Amino acid sequence: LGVAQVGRMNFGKDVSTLKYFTICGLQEGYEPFAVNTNRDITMWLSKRLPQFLQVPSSHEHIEVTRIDVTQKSFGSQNSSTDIMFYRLSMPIECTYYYSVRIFPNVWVGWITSDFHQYDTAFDLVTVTLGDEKGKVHESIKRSNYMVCANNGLEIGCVVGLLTFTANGKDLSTYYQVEPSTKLFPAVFAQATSPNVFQFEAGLFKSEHKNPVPQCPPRLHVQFLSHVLWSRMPNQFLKVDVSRISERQGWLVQCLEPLQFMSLHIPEENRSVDILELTEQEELLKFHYHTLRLYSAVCALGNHRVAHALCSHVDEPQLLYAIENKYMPGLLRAGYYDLLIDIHLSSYATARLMMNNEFIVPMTEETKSITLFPDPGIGLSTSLRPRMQFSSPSFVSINNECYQYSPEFPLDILKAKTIQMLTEAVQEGSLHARDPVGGTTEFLFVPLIKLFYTLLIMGIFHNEDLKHILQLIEPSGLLQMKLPEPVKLQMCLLLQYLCDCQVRHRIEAIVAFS
Amino acid sequence: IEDPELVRAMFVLLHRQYDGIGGLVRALPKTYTINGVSVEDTINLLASLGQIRSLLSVEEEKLMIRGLGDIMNNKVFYQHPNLMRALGMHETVMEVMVNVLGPKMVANCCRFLCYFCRISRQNQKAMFDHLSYLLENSSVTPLDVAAASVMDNNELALALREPDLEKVVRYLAGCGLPVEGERYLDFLRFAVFCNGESVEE
Amino acid sequence: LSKKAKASTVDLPIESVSLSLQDLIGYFHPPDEHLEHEDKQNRLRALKNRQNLFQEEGMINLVLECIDRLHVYSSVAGREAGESWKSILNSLYELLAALIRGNRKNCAQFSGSLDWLISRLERLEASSGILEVLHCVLVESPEALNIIKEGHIKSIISLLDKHGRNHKVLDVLCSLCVCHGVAVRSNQHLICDNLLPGRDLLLQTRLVNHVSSMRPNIFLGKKWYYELMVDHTEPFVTAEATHLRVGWASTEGYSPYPGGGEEWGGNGVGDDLFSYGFDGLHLWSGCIARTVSSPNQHLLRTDDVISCCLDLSAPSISFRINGQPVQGMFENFNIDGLFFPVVSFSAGIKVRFLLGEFKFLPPPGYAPCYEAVLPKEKLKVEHSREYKQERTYTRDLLGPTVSAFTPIPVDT
Amino acid sequence: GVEIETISPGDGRTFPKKGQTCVVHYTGMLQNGKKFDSSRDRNKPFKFRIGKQEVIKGFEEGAAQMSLGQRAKLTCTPDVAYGATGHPGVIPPNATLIFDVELLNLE
């Protein structure tokens, strides 16, 4: 689109609004984007606000060099040398200093992370003190990008507060105001001549990472030389709001809440919505592997590490991550396996240890089996083990607490998964090319896995198992076309069903005998 | 069909359909019935049994010693030793000790097994069958369970053979410096007398 | 060449050694997947036989000595023939990964020297080989999991802060806490103690409400003054508290995107936005809240009237609730472009603009915003410049922008 | 001795006595703004008894000054918090805790 243009696309599913698809299209051997999709396909517009980025070889000539004081060289002898905003990767929060050495007008300073004002000039917080009586009105704040101007050895000493030097001569403008802010070391520049920058009382990098004696400074590969660049696509925020308005008094109104699922990178501080990992591969794969480690650490019954991770992944997040039909393929299975390995894989193994012991009391309700009403099992008075769940609060009675598991409500989840299964089979039965995780493995595999582990754990009673058998039997998920690792799960779904009759029949024999 | 876990999980499920009575065969020597007045304690047995079994896969030993202490002092552990013979819980503790023997765990382990033989006759017969490995682990107790497996019953006193005894006097030949002979011979006295009359063979 | 200066020693083959390493790598190569199952077993068995026959003569130690020797410099010697020293060394560790990959018998003999490997893990020039060798050790023997102590795990942790985002570190740590079958619960408390509570090496996640703001189409570049009336609150309809912020914003800069840019979106979040209003109404500017007070410490409740103020030809913004002064302190910011009211919300909140049809206001100072709408414009409301418009078929897309009582007279 | 910021006003007059169980919805975060605990997350109102030494001291002290309807931003100093040891996994060593508590019902 251009300057004052209005566009209107339609990605299928508008066959009634498909105006000329009859006279050209259908009989001419073509198709819309309606042939499979029950979602809305997301749109990726380009951004207006710029955001800083790493430096690949995608310039005519830009080359930062990790050298060993311990500097970072450059080069910009090209056709376009207009504006190149530079910053280091990680910032400092709230004693050490920082060097630059320019040959040819060209600035240095500190960027607070809220900065996207690409401008070829000098411009931009300024709030006064309030002591409830007026009467002070002086200052609390200055900062927002700092400005300074052979070898120019300008050095930004910080903390504490903010100062400056210029080849030994400290200039003015000591912005001594930042309460607990984060400070990017940064450089605004034009480049005239090449080899323009070099970077780096004790010395610097100790005040930055986690080892903090570290008086000899030492570069690491995590340091970068980020450049403010213009455009990267954004997701469309597929369902927005149902705001409503008025005119006599202007009642603007909204009542239907919608919630994000964001994650903020801590060392390059910004919050990304989790859906935009769909195309960003490294930030996908590392978070997937972290979701694996959150399960592998809390494995085989560590009932205190589970109480640690319930404060860290925080259950109403998981109920979003089950439900949202847009999340990527790996990250769906990661959150399902994390749910099972936090709340459900402690008790489920404790019931698959006692699946072949079959002991039963001989009292009056045990004799009361009719044995054969002439899987959704009626009375079932065997002596299966006992589940206890603990609330994961934060008080100092934790030694009695951290002994069983964390708890999160089963009554919601066991209707959520039946709703999800019906929505799954009855939609995906007609062979969409959509399905949620991209391929039908991530659609079904970590849904039937939760369904299996919830089936074992002693819920889905008669009133719901009657609803459950309709999805498989009708007498259908068992009858469809399925790949290999989903019917692998269905075999273990069938085996417990066959194994329920044996537990019925043993209690039948005892009720007779 | 590739992914041969799928083939195996298919055919086991297929064979269980056409052999129902075989499935009922391999489930009847595990069942058991108990009177109602003993419902409440065996759950506290069963829930204290799984803490043993879930501790099978790991200073990690203080849980096991308290678990065996809660099992040994239980009301229904004398009362129906067919149950504890059928739940495999002689083999559970045996496997735990075998996992240890690649210090105070073995000592409070084998005392449970020496408690396990002296409650029934058939239970001692069930305990007997690991003796061939069980003799190879003289630490200093792990030999006491080899003793109290053959302590009293004459049929088990007759059943064991000469290679089981030959490695005992091999260990005695190893005592050719001693002090470890006062226990080894304490095994062999149970091997030849066992009631009051010396078994000829 | 470990002497002072030999400088003439010809007994130093390079192209005969750097060739031979690729021949040994190709000799110890694992068989692929695309192979028949009657010969895949043959090639697997032959590979294990080659690994054991190389084990028994101690070639592991014979390459460990070259690793001991070569980790002196960082770029050496006559520095043109030994130009490929990195590409030898990286190819060296690779050979070490091939000799230990299958045989657990190999892995047991590589138990004792792991501490020296994690000592060399801070070399950070051939760490890719070291991490591969360690990961290809830890899954194959359980005995090699017993040596490794807390000082090693903390070094493995510290590599993850020095080196950004390396998923093979988490492929190591996913195997450090679960062996073949068993769970080494001294390592699981340790990993949970170190890597977790810093919230620094890992991508922390959360869920927030969708933010949205509204503009009543009015543009303003004397004492401008507009009111609100809040009538429905919902302090908690989420597993979190809701937001409701009033204020002003400018037009030249900061397209108002929901959540995906700065932290959480909303209002008072950029420098071009000046906002205020809370339960305990303290302000926002540049998404850091300061703690101004008022003599009730109230909510934006169901019974309140907010008095916002903005000054023409003066850089002063101060607010008022029910007429009471709250010591608004927004002073001396930039004057570029215009200003317009923005008031933001995310709840079941309905609120009333008081502009006309006023309900209760003093005018104090001098300007009402019913007179900024004097010449031709009307009082219609929009959704803060609207890169969306929620509808069924097509949210119609847009082009960016094309951009007052003081013009100039024309001279002759 | 602990920082009690009133957010919403309750009734002011009825502060709870010792020997009563107190119902509270509380959402706690760190000094950085990272939310480490909630009570709205699980839809369960917390319950605790004054003086019985189960809760951390700053929480009980800041709840003892509150009232019915009154919600507060308790800012606990790390000496009254988990301290130099912190908590193993959820709380880094020596950090201030910022709770938004809100009391509901008493005994």
PDB file of N, CA and C in Angstrom, chain B residues 59-105:
ATOM      1  N   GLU B  59      22.673 -40.659  50.495  1.00  0.00           N
ATOM      2  CA  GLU B  59      21.744 -39.907  51.320  1.00  0.00           C
ATOM      3  C   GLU B  59      20.336 -40.180  50.855  1.00  0.00           C
ATOM      4  N   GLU B  60      20.228 -40.883  49.738  1.00  0.00           N
ATOM      5  CA  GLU B  60      18.939 -41.234  49.161  1.00  0.00           C
ATOM      6  C   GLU B  60      18.239 -42.365  49.901  1.00  0.00           C
ATOM      7  N   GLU B  61      18.805 -42.839  51.005  1.00  0.00           N
ATOM      8  CA  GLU B  61      18.387 -44.072  51.629  1.00  0.00           C
ATOM      9  C   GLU B  61      17.567 -43.880  52.888  1.00  0.00           C
ATOM     10  N   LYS B  62      17.495 -42.667  53.436  1.00  0.00           N
ATOM     11  CA  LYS B  62      16.741 -42.462  54.665  1.00  0.00           C
ATOM     12  C   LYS B  62      15.252 -42.630  54.458  1.00  0.00           C
ATOM     13  N   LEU B  63      14.767 -42.437  53.239  1.00  0.00           N
ATOM     14  CA  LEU B  63      13.372 -42.710  52.958  1.00  0.00           C
ATOM     15  C   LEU B  63      13.079 -44.197  53.004  1.00  0.00           C
ATOM     16  N   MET B  64      13.994 -45.011  52.475  1.00  0.00           N
ATOM     17  CA  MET B  64      13.774 -46.450  52.393  1.00  0.00           C
ATOM     18  C   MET B  64      13.785 -47.093  53.765  1.00  0.00           C
ATOM     19  N   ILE B  65      14.649 -46.610  54.654  1.00  0.00           N
ATOM     20  CA  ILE B  65      14.771 -47.214  55.971  1.00  0.00           C
ATOM     21  C   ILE B  65      13.529 -46.925  56.803  1.00  0.00           C
ATOM     22  N   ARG B  66      13.004 -45.706  56.706  1.00  0.00           N
ATOM     23  CA  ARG B  66      11.735 -45.401  57.356  1.00  0.00           C
ATOM     24  C   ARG B  66      10.579 -46.151  56.715  1.00  0.00           C
ATOM     25  N   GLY B  67      10.628 -46.373  55.400  1.00  0.00           N
ATOM     26  CA  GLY B  67       9.559 -47.113  54.751  1.00  0.00           C
ATOM     27  C   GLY B  67       9.517 -48.565  55.185  1.00  0.00           C
ATOM     28  N   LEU B  68      10.681 -49.205  55.234  1.00  0.00           N
ATOM     29  CA  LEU B  68      10.752 -50.574  55.720  1.00  0.00           C
ATOM     30  C   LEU B  68      10.409 -50.657  57.196  1.00  0.00           C
ATOM     31  N   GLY B  69      10.737 -49.621  57.969  1.00  0.00           N
ATOM     32  CA  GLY B  69      10.299 -49.584  59.350  1.00  0.00           C
ATOM     33  C   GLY B  69       8.797 -49.466  59.495  1.00  0.00           C
ATOM     34  N   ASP B  70       8.148 -48.733  58.596  1.00  0.00           N
ATOM     35  CA  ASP B  70       6.697 -48.650  58.655  1.00  0.00           C
ATOM     36  C   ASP B  70       6.027 -49.897  58.121  1.00  0.00           C
ATOM     37  N   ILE B  71       6.707 -50.646  57.263  1.00  0.00           N
ATOM     38  CA  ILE B  71       6.111 -51.872  56.751  1.00  0.00           C
ATOM     39  C   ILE B  71       6.255 -53.003  57.763  1.00  0.00           C
ATOM     40  N   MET B  72       7.432 -53.123  58.390  1.00  0.00           N
ATOM     41  CA  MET B  72       7.686 -54.224  59.316  1.00  0.00           C
ATOM     42  C   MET B  72       6.811 -54.150  60.552  1.00  0.00           C
ATOM     43  N   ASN B  73       6.529 -52.952  61.037  1.00  0.00           N
ATOM     44  CA  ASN B  73       5.719 -52.789  62.230  1.00  0.00           C
ATOM     45  C   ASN B  73       4.235 -52.772  61.932  1.00  0.00           C
ATOM     46  N   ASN B  74       3.830 -53.148  60.729  1.00  0.00           N
ATOM     47  CA  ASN B  74       2.431 -53.033  60.385  1.00  0.00           C
ATOM     48  C   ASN B  74       1.647 -54.191  60.975  1.00  0.00           C
ATOM     49  N   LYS B  75       0.352 -53.948  61.173  1.00  0.00           N
ATOM     50  CA  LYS B  75      -0.532 -54.975  61.702  1.00  0.00           C
ATOM     51  C   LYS B  75      -0.665 -56.129  60.723  1.00  0.00           C
ATOM     52  N   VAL B  76      -1.098 -55.844  59.500  1.00  0.00           N
ATOM     53  CA  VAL B  76      -1.178 -56.884  58.472  1.00  0.00           C
ATOM     54  C   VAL B  76       0.165 -56.877  57.759  1.00  0.00           C
ATOM     55  N   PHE B  77       1.139 -57.443  58.420  1.00  0.00           N
ATOM     56  CA  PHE B  77       2.295 -58.025  57.762  1.00  0.00           C
ATOM     57  C   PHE B  77       2.608 -59.406  58.297  1.00  0.00           C
ATOM     58  N   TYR B  78       2.266 -59.691  59.547  1.00  0.00           N
ATOM     59  CA  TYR B  78       2.230 -61.063  60.013  1.00  0.00           C
ATOM     60  C   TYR B  78       1.045 -61.794  59.419  1.00  0.00           C
ATOM     61  N   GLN B  79      -0.104 -61.124  59.369  1.00  0.00           N
ATOM     62  CA  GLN B  79      -1.390 -61.798  59.307  1.00  0.00           C
ATOM     63  C   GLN B  79      -1.666 -62.514  57.998  1.00  0.00           C
ATOM     64  N   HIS B  80      -1.191 -62.027  56.861  1.00  0.00           N
ATOM     65  CA  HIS B  80      -1.408 -62.715  55.592  1.00  0.00           C
ATOM     66  C   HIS B  80      -0.156 -62.696  54.739  1.00  0.00           C
ATOM     67  N   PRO B  81       0.814 -63.569  55.021  1.00  0.00           N
ATOM     68  CA  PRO B  81       2.063 -63.566  54.248  1.00  0.00           C
ATOM     69  C   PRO B  81       1.919 -64.051  52.820  1.00  0.00           C
ATOM     70  N   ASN B  82       0.771 -64.609  52.445  1.00  0.00           N
ATOM     71  CA  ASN B  82       0.525 -64.862  51.035  1.00  0.00           C
ATOM     72  C   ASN B  82       0.426 -63.568  50.244  1.00  0.00           C
ATOM     73  N   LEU B  83      -0.117 -62.515  50.860  1.00  0.00           N
ATOM     74  CA  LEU B  83      -0.182 -61.210  50.213  1.00  0.00           C
ATOM     75  C   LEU B  83       1.199 -60.682  49.901  1.00  0.00           C
ATOM     76  N   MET B  84       2.067 -60.656  50.899  1.00  0.00           N
ATOM     77  CA  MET B  84       3.393 -60.123  50.682  1.00  0.00           C
ATOM     78  C   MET B  84       4.254 -61.051  49.853  1.00  0.00           C
ATOM     79  N   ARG B  85       3.911 -62.329  49.782  1.00  0.00           N
ATOM     80  CA  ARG B  85       4.570 -63.189  48.817  1.00  0.00           C
ATOM     81  C   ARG B  85       4.099 -62.913  47.405  1.00  0.00           C
ATOM     82  N   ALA B  86       2.859 -62.457  47.244  1.00  0.00           N
ATOM     83  CA  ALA B  86       2.289 -62.253  45.920  1.00  0.00           C
ATOM     84  C   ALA B  86       2.508 -60.852  45.371  1.00  0.00           C
ATOM     85  N   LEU B  87       2.746 -59.862  46.228  1.00  0.00           N
ATOM     86  CA  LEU B  87       3.020 -58.523  45.729  1.00  0.00           C
ATOM     87  C   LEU B  87       4.457 -58.364  45.279  1.00  0.00           C
ATOM     88  N   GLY B  88       5.262 -59.410  45.363  1.00  0.00           N
ATOM     89  CA  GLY B  88       6.631 -59.336  44.919  1.00  0.00           C
ATOM     90  C   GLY B  88       7.561 -58.619  45.858  1.00  0.00           C
ATOM     91  N   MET B  89       7.113 -58.288  47.064  1.00  0.00           N
ATOM     92  CA  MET B  89       7.908 -57.399  47.889  1.00  0.00           C
ATOM     93  C   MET B  89       9.064 -58.087  48.576  1.00  0.00           C
ATOM     94  N   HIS B  90       9.285 -59.367  48.340  1.00  0.00           N
ATOM     95  CA  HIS B  90      10.615 -59.879  48.584  1.00  0.00           C
ATOM     96  C   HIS B  90      11.556 -59.526  47.457  1.00  0.00           C
ATOM     97  N   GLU B  91      11.083 -59.549  46.218  1.00  0.00           N
ATOM     98  CA  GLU B  91      11.947 -59.211  45.104  1.00  0.00           C
ATOM     99  C   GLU B  91      12.226 -57.725  44.997  1.00  0.00           C
ATOM    100  N   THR B  92      11.327 -56.887  45.510  1.00  0.00           N
ATOM    101  CA  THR B  92      11.543 -55.445  45.516  1.00  0.00           C
ATOM    102  C   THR B  92      12.767 -55.075  46.336  1.00  0.00           C
ATOM    103  N   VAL B  93      12.804 -55.531  47.589  1.00  0.00           N
ATOM    104  CA  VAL B  93      13.913 -55.224  48.470  1.00  0.00           C
ATOM    105  C   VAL B  93      15.184 -55.895  47.997  1.00  0.00           C
ATOM    106  N   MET B  94      15.052 -57.084  47.412  1.00  0.00           N
ATOM    107  CA  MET B  94      16.190 -57.771  46.822  1.00  0.00           C
ATOM    108  C   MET B  94      16.802 -56.947  45.705  1.00  0.00           C
ATOM    109  N   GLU B  95      15.961 -56.381  44.846  1.00  0.00           N
ATOM    110  CA  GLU B  95      16.442 -55.528  43.775  1.00  0.00           C
ATOM    111  C   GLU B  95      17.075 -54.246  44.291  1.00  0.00           C
ATOM    112  N   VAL B  96      16.534 -53.671  45.366  1.00  0.00           N
ATOM    113  CA  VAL B  96      17.127 -52.469  45.949  1.00  0.00           C
ATOM    114  C   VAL B  96      18.529 -52.755  46.473  1.00  0.00           C
ATOM    115  N   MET B  97      18.681 -53.865  47.191  1.00  0.00           N
ATOM    116  CA  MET B  97      19.985 -54.239  47.721  1.00  0.00           C
ATOM    117  C   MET B  97      20.971 -54.559  46.608  1.00  0.00           C
ATOM    118  N   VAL B  98      20.504 -55.221  45.547  1.00  0.00           N
ATOM    119  CA  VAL B  98      21.363 -55.527  44.408  1.00  0.00           C
ATOM    120  C   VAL B  98      21.809 -54.250  43.721  1.00  0.00           C
ATOM    121  N   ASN B  99      20.928 -53.253  43.669  1.00  0.00           N
ATOM    122  CA  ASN B  99      21.306 -51.946  43.153  1.00  0.00           C
ATOM    123  C   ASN B  99      22.367 -51.295  44.030  1.00  0.00           C
ATOM    124  N   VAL B 100      22.319 -51.544  45.339  1.00  0.00           N
ATOM    125  CA  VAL B 100      23.335 -50.963  46.212  1.00  0.00           C
ATOM    126  C   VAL B 100      24.683 -51.640  46.009  1.00  0.00           C
ATOM    127  N   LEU B 101      24.712 -52.965  46.024  1.00  0.00           N
ATOM    128  CA  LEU B 101      25.954 -53.733  45.936  1.00  0.00           C
ATOM    129  C   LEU B 101      26.416 -53.731  44.491  1.00  0.00           C
ATOM    130  N   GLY B 102      27.144 -52.690  44.119  1.00  0.00           N
ATOM    131  CA  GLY B 102      27.585 -52.514  42.750  1.00  0.00           C
ATOM    132  C   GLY B 102      28.623 -53.513  42.289  1.00  0.00           C
ATOM    133  N   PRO B 103      26.236 -48.209  53.015  1.00  0.00           N
ATOM    134  CA  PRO B 103      26.709 -49.146  54.037  1.00  0.00           C
ATOM    135  C   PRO B 103      25.648 -49.488  55.063  1.00  0.00           C
ATOM    136  N   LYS B 104      24.967 -48.490  55.611  1.00  0.00           N
ATOM    137  CA  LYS B 104      23.898 -48.756  56.562  1.00  0.00           C
ATOM    138  C   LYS B 104      22.584 -49.087  55.885  1.00  0.00           C
ATOM    139  N   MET B 105      22.553 -49.105  54.556  1.00  0.00           N
ATOM    140  CA  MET B 105      21.361 -49.520  53.837  1.00  0.00           C
ATOM    141  C   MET B 105      21.228 -51.031  53.795  1.00  0.00           C
TER     142      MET B 105
END
